[PDB]
Amino acid sequence: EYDLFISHASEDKEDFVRPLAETLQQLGVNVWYDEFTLKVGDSLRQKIDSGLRNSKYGTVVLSTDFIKKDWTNYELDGLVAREMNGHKMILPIWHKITKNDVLDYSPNLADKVALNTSVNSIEEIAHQLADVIL
Amino acid sequence: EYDLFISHASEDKEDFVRPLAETLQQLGVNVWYDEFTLKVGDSLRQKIDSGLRNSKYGTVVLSTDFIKKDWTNYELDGLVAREMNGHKMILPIWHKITKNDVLDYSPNLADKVALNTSVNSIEEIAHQLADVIL
Amino acid sequence: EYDLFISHASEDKEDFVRPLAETLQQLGVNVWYDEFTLKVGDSLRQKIDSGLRNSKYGTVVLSTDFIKKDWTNYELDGLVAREMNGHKMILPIWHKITKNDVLDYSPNLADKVALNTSVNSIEEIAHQLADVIL
Amino acid sequence: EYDLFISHASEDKEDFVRPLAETLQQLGVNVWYDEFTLKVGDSLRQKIDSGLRNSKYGTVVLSTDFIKKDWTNYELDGLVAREMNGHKMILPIWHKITKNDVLDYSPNLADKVALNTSVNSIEEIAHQLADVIL
Ligand SMILES: Nc1cccc2cc[n+]([C@@H]3O[C@H](COP(=O)(O)OP(=O)(O)OC[C@H]4O[C@@H](n5cnc6c(N)ncnc65)[C@H](O)[C@@H]4O)[C@@H](O)[C@H]3O)cc12
Numbered sequence: 387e388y389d390l391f392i393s394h395a396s397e398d399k400e401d402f403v404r405p406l407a408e409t410l411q412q413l414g415v416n417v418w419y420d421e422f423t424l425k426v427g428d429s430l431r432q433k434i435d436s437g438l439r440n441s442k443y444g445t446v447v448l449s450t451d452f453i454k455k456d457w458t459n460y461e462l463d464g465l466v467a468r469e470m471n472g473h474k475m476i477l478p479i480w481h482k483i484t485k486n487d488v489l490d491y492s493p494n495l496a497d498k499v500a501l502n503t504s505v506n507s508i509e510e511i512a513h514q515l516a517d518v519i520l
Numbered sequence: 521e522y523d524l525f526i527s528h529a530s531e532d533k534e535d536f537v538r539p540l541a542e543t544l545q546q547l548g549v550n551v552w553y554d555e556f557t558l559k560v561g562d563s564l565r566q567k568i569d570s571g572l573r574n575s576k577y578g579t580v581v582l583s584t585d586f587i588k589k590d591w592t593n594y595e596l597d598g599l600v601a602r603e604m605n606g607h608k609m610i611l612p613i614w615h616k617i618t619k620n621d622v623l624d625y626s627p628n629l630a631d632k633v634a635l636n637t638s639v640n641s642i643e644e645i646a647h648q649l650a651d652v653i654l
Numbered sequence: 655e656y657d658l659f660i661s662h663a664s665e666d667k668e669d670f671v672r673p674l675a676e677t678l679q680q681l682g683v684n685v686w687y688d689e690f691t692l693k694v695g696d697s698l699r700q701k702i703d704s705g706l707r708n709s710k711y712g713t714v715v716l717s718t719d720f721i722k723k724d725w726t727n728y729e730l731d732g733l734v735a736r737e738m739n740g741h742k743m744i745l746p747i748w749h750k751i752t753k754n755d756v757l758d759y760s761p762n763l764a765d766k767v768a769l770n771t772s773v774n775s776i777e778e779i780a781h782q783l784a785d786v787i788l
Numbered sequence: 789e790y791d792l793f794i795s796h797a798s799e800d801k802e803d804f805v806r807p808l809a810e811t812l813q814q815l816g817v818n819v820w821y822d823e824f825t826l827k828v829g830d831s832l833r834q835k836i837d838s839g840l841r842n843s844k845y846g847t848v849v850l851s852t853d854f855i856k857k858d859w860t861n862y863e864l865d866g867l868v869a870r871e872m873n874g875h876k877m878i879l880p881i882w883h884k885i886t887k888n889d890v891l892d893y894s895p896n897l898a899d900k901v902a903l904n905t906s907v908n909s910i911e912e913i914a915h916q917l918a919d920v921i922l
């Protein structure tokens with residue numbers, strides 16, 4: 387069902403991630419985003435697990451807060467596991483972070499071409515993503 | 521697939537290399553150029569290695585910045601390795617650099633005939649390259 | 655902490671890599687090897703990433719099975735990313751493989767001097783490595 | 789640093805070139821020889837280029853196998869390039885080869901005085917070289 391899963395830290399919602407998800411839907415991507423999918427009484431574990439398993443692609447918004455928190459590391463551990471079984475997925479974004487900070491977090495992600503929010507705007511990034519997914 | 525691989529420093533894009541690559545495609549050469557080929561989520565290592573291995577020829581834009589940087593030296597190591605197995609490839613260009621500076625970088629490249637950007641224009645250089653490749 | 659990280663395919667453990675790692679420790683190199691470090695309940699992603707980032711050197715056992723598999727290519731991407739930031743690391747070994755097969759995998763590794771297991775024995779290779787590391 | 793660079797084919801190591809290089813060091817010449825300088829993980833291109841550029845003199849062992857191979861012709865290109873900038877270097881040796889075979893390879897080397905291994909012994913040749921270098 388879903389085309390893209392969005393993994394992000396809650397400190398980045400208002401200035402970046404909410405505008406991004408809203409514009410991707412307007413282009414026509416079917417997106418998994420937590421404010422759209424999770425409802426009262428749902429199991430967090432079981433809903434996240436089935437969202438990770440049923441998405442064609444996943445995007446990760448790398449940030450200083452992303453590195454520290456628990457649920458963000460839970461999601462990225464699951465994306466790499468599915469990619470090491472033969473299915474390529476990960477589309478990275480760099481937000482307020484430099485190459486050296488990424489290379490100190492993991493040197494394998496420093497090998498992957500990312501979109502940098504200090505160089506591209508929100509809609510300029512959204513157009514780049516939809517060209518791969520669609 | 522590709523006819524030519526272009527190896528250059530990013531400081532030289534706007535005043536020389538972007539005009540050159542645009543005019544080569546208009547003559548009909550099938551060219552490997554990083555702004556045309558690399559996309560979000562690609563592995564840099566694995567895409568560059570298959571570009572080097574599947575091209576008939578390679579051109580190197582010698583420059584004061586080309587000498588210092590890392591990825592430029594990575595690409596030239598791979599071109600010489602394939603040439604020392606019996607397949608001639610390299611077509612050199614000298615940009616803002618003199619014979620002495622080239623001879624201090626490597627005396628073997630000082631033996632190979634090159635196109636000098638202080639003597640020829642962009643389209644005059646492009647016409648010279650296509651006569652060898654095509 | 656670690657002096658050397660060993661990257662290898664699991665098909666090569668018993669006739670080559672297990673004897674090699676055992677003899678390197680006896681010479682006194684502090685080595686990262688998966689049978690010594692990984693334990694029940696560890697995250698594979700997070701433990702491999704910190705092993706790559708905290709080692710002075712890395713060795714890669716090039717082999718016909720190494721080229722095909724997923725986790726072997728994951729590790730080599732991270733080594734090259736750290737080397738293209740200015741820190742030299744890679745010490746290559748050729749096992750049951752010829753120059754032509756290496757040049758068809760990547761022409762840049764064909765430029766780097768390697769130890770060939772058809773020419774040198776296990777302890778003769780181990781002595782060569784420790785002279786660089788120590 | 790280096791006084792002499794030795795350029796030779798690997799088919800000639802055991803019966804001529806290893807004894808020669810060992811006796812030159814005993815006289816006190818500082819020599820560039822591949823078995824003494826190159827180590828695991830070195831770039832072949834970048835180490836050879838800095839050896840050619842930092843030596844006062846160069847010697848070439850002309851032989852039937854020398855003429856055919858690739859890396860032997862690579863080194864002689866760089867020596868002539870530096871000599872055509874005004875710095876005399878080349879000290880030739882003829883091994884199992886006649887004047888006619890040299891003249892068919894290049895008529896300019898047939899003009900330079902050479903040492904012939906059918907007329908002089910190893911130590912008799914080594915004494916002749918050191919009188920020029922030292
Ligand atoms: N939508 C969501 C609702 C609830 C929990 C979520 C956890 C994670 N996520 C997923 O993970 C990324 C965010 O990681 P995160 O690390 O930013 O999240 P936090 O841990 O900060 O939690 C955020 C806030 O939920 C409050 N809280 C904690 N347990 C609670 C509970 N049972 N009932 C009510 N409220 C609770 C907690 O008090 C804080 O105010 C996203 O991509 C997303 O897919 C989304 C969540």
Ligand SMILES: Nc1cccc2cc[n+]([C@@H]3O[C@H](COP(=O)(O)OP(=O)(O)OC[C@H]4O[C@@H](n5cnc6c(N)ncnc65)[C@H](O)[C@@H]4O)[C@@H](O)[C@H]3O)cc12
Nearest residue numbers: 496497498499500526527528529530554558589590591592
């Ligand atoms: N197109 C390209 C994109 C990304 C990296 C490239 C590296 C090399 N090349 C190849 O090598 C020659 C240029 O050498 P170069 O030495 O000029 O390049 P730089 O190292 O300066 O990198 C240039 C910029 O990429 C930024 N950067 C670094 N890692 C990044 C990452 N994972 N995701 C996003 N951005 C990243 C880095 O912040 C800088 O602003 C060309 O012929 C070409 O074929 C092309 C590249």
Ligand SMILES: Nc1cccc2cc[n+]([C@@H]3O[C@H](COP(=O)(O)OP(=O)(O)OC[C@H]4O[C@@H](n5cnc6c(N)ncnc65)[C@H](O)[C@@H]4O)[C@@H](O)[C@H]3O)cc12
Nearest residue numbers: 660661662663664665688689692698702723724725726729
């Ligand atoms: N030590 C190790 C344990 C587990 C997984 C590893 C993966 C990779 N490595 C690293 O990568 C190189 C080897 O690449 P490799 O490609 O040889 O490995 P394989 O994919 O063949 O996995 C080998 C076996 O683990 C079984 N398996 C898969 N997921 C499993 C899981 N969660 N729990 C239990 N067992 C699992 C899988 O069934 C097969 O029998 C080494 O340098 C090393 O640093 C080492 C591993």
Ligand SMILES: Nc1cccc2cc[n+]([C@@H]3O[C@H](COP(=O)(O)OP(=O)(O)OC[C@H]4O[C@@H](n5cnc6c(N)ncnc65)[C@H](O)[C@@H]4O)[C@@H](O)[C@H]3O)cc12
Nearest residue numbers: 764765766767768794795796797798822826857858859860
């Ligand atoms: N010391 C040396 C080591 C390696 C390569 C050299 C190349 C050239 N040289 C220089 O050139 C003259 C000799 O020309 P040459 O033409 O005699 O040499 P070959 O091409 O026959 O190579 C000889 C052997 O290296 C094996 N081979 C090829 N690539 C390899 C690689 N990455 N890692 C491991 N082994 C590799 C290849 O399998 C063969 O067995 C000398 O004056 C010297 O300064 C010296 C070399």
